[PDB]
Paper text:
Here, we present high-resolution crystal structures of apo CbFDH determined at cryogenic and ambient temperatures, as well as as that of the highly active Val120Thr mutant of CbFDH at cryogenic temperature. The inherent capability of the enzyme to catalyze the conversion of CO2 to formate holds significant potential for reducing atmospheric CO2 levels.
Therefore, in addition to the structure obtained at cryogenic temperature, we also determined the structure of wild-type CbFDH at ambient temperature. The reason might be that flash-cooling in liquid nitrogen captured the protein in its most stable state in solution, which we also observed in the ambient temperature structure. The cryogenic temperature structure exhibited a significantly higher number of identified water molecules, with 2179 waters resolved, compared with the ambient temperature structure with only 393 water molecules. The higher resolution achieved at cryogenic temperatures significantly improves the accuracy of identifying water molecules compared with the ambient temperature structures at lower resolution.
Residue numbers in the entry:
A (entry chain B): 1 to 353
B (entry chain A): 1 to 356
The structure:
Amino acid sequence: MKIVLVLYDAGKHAADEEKLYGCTENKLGIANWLKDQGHELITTSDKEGGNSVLDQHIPDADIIITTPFHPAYITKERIDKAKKLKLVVVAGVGSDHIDLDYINQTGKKISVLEVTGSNVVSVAEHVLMTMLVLVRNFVPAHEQIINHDWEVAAIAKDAYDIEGKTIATIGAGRIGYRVLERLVPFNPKELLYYDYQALPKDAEEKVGARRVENIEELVAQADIVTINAPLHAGTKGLINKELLSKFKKGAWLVNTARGAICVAEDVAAALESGQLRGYGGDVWFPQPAPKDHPWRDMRNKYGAGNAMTPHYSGTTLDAQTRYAEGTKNILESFFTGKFDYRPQDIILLNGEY
Amino acid sequence: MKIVLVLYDAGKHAADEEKLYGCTENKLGIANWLKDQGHELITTSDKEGGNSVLDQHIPDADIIITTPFHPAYITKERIDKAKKLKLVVVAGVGSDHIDLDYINQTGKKISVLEVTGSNVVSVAEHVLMTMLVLVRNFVPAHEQIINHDWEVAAIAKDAYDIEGKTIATIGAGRIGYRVLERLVPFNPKELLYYDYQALPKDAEEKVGARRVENIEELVAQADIVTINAPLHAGTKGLINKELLSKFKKGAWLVNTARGAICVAEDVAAALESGQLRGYGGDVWFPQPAPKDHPWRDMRNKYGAGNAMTPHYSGTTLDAQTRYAEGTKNILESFFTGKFDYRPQDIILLNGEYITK
């Protein structure tokens, strides 16, 4: 079979770190395994334009492997020309870039699977780190040192302990709950959550969480808000100026789910005006963020309150090992004809939900 | 009575934030309380030199109040001239700037107290933050964004999850144990500790810690090492070229206890050579850190691995409230003649140690 694998070029960075599996130069660490079975692997990062390498091999590709960190868009046109396509794998979590609805609508026997759960711990750690960095005012603290200054009172005037604060998550799924687990020993005043379905009673009691019924009430009483909910019609532009004015004055806000859940200019305005004390996360809209994206230069009144990073929380070396191993398990189930997929990994089974 | 209060000057920042109690401008929020009680308060940051404000009022001061973040050194020479000194207070935790030995050995009747426990959570949170920052390679990640760059592979190649890592602490006291308590739900591979005495069996089971008899074996197997021990003859210069050579290759190291526990240039050389992946903390020697202190500019081979900050982990606004309240409670015990101090706050009571 012909496998096409779309990843980013890591350049010289690939050669320093051989554990960096998710690049074109290291090919998820499965290139030899695919060769041993007897299979043709096409690896490329060129995914844009009609004449791209990806489009030259789509007509006869049996399998396409993509990643959310260099996402090849599987469009209606591309699916039309994919005569032999049987399986699409996301080496990671996230299928925004796949036209799932059209595949289902045409009747083609195409399976779409992802490595469910490979990213949850990585992202949840990123949230807590981001929380601590913002609350404890770490960014200006470190900037002082490498600028060769020493002025504690400039740092301490906006520095707080995370102990004794009310922390709220919008969304209590895999990521949001594991965030709540890690906050317990820090002794928050209260842990709150809002979601479209209740946490199981036993899960709720393990973390001492309280469910709030509507979002305006949740953010009104929370010192810290973290966004851990999927992007659909209900959450698109959810964080706009009207809701932000309902936030506790001087709150902290973390978002690692999807940049489009926020209105970029409203968040920046709130940080400048003081409605927010800090904003941090690793998701942007548009993504990758242009040089002019307002979230790059936004700062609270003190020149701080920005804990932004590129989209890498889920591409740590430990997560990549899980992506590579999960992709191998998925291909194994498909090559052998067993189709013994993990149920949580199936997005579409032969064109069906 | 006369009280001398020695804090740093916060300048404009005091105006920005009324809750910034630990500066000369806001005087721990007790100035009006002391005035009503009819005492004389002296507030100064001038603490060095023989004609400083501190030395001008030492001869007849009844009480001196200090902070570790702008320490006035209660030396033998200064103790000899304090004719009326009865009480020395640490608005915070830390007594290295006080000559406790001279007081206890002479027998002068001076009580020394500190606000015990008021810094523990603040410091422990700072330790977890630094660990996640270094392990997840956050500093180069952020510098990319504010420099208007976007290159994920340059960050991802040295970024890790703290899950499944081996974490060890040198010292399992109040702060050391707190760090372990908060690490448990991050699912480390194993938690280790080294100390001159063992934790109680229950304390060990709660965090699932395993004791390691000698440091050389502790560091050799640890992905992450954090120092939470006091500075004494056994820990001064502990982290040096010899011991660092026996760390696990590519180790992360965090220190929020005392700068002198490390040899500054041995650490920098270890970081530059690849022995350490990163180093972080808020404690320095000398402190405040000179502009050319090597720890400011050191970086790992990728230009990352530095998570240093000024000495501020225990002076967050939450902690300063605890420091300010505790000082007021201590003075109230002294002024009323009750001397009903919290037992854990006493370092020396009338020049004598007490059962702990």
